[PDB]
Amino acid sequence: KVFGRCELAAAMKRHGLDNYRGYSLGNWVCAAKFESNFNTQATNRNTDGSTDYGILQINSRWWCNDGRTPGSRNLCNIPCSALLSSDITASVNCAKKIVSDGNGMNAWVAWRNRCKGTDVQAWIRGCRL
């Protein structure tokens, strides 16, 4: 599924991400835009051989099992394929664990490089939330 901007904002808010660990909703939408272009089916291989899956590009090295990432963990206890669903529940639940891990949203390199320090409220402008 390719979400619309406000559609995704509403789904993330319903799942309790607005101000989760202090990160306003526009941070989460901005991250999703640059990670996946709001496409649940996005997959991208990393240099280390791991793969990032779904709307928030969650990595197989630590967070999900994809059966092909050596020496890796599965801290969200989920197959990576479940992160590609049109239902974002698994992605959101796993993201909540990631952002609690110590480094906040800096775990998402695209958030650090393209969202952090910007006017992220722009990402939810015009949405009925």
Residues classed as catalytic: 35, 52
Q: Edge-to-edge strands of the sheet including 51-53? A: 43-45, 51-53, 58-59
Q: What is the sign, positive or negative, of the torsion defined by CA atoms of 89, 79, 32, 62?
A: positive
Instruction: With beta carbons less than 8 A apart as the criterion, state whether 51 and 69 touch.
Output: yes
What is the SS3 assignment for 47? Answer: coil
Site for Na ion contains 51 (CB under 5 A): no
Q: How far is the CB of 55 from Cl ion (least distance, A)?
A: 12
Site for Cl ion contains 116 (CB under 5 A): no
Q: Which of 40, 51, 57, 69 binds Cl ion (CB under 5 A)?
A: 69
Fill in the per-residue mask, 7 to 36: x = in contact with Cl ion (CB under 5 A), - = not in contact. Answer: x---x--x---------xxx----------
In the bound state with Na ion, the residue whose beta carbon lies nearer, of 5 and 62, is 62
User: If you search the block for the tokens 């992605």, which residue do you land on?
Assistant: 91
Contact residues for Na ion, defined by CB under 5 A: 35, 57, 60, 65, 69, 72, 74, 110
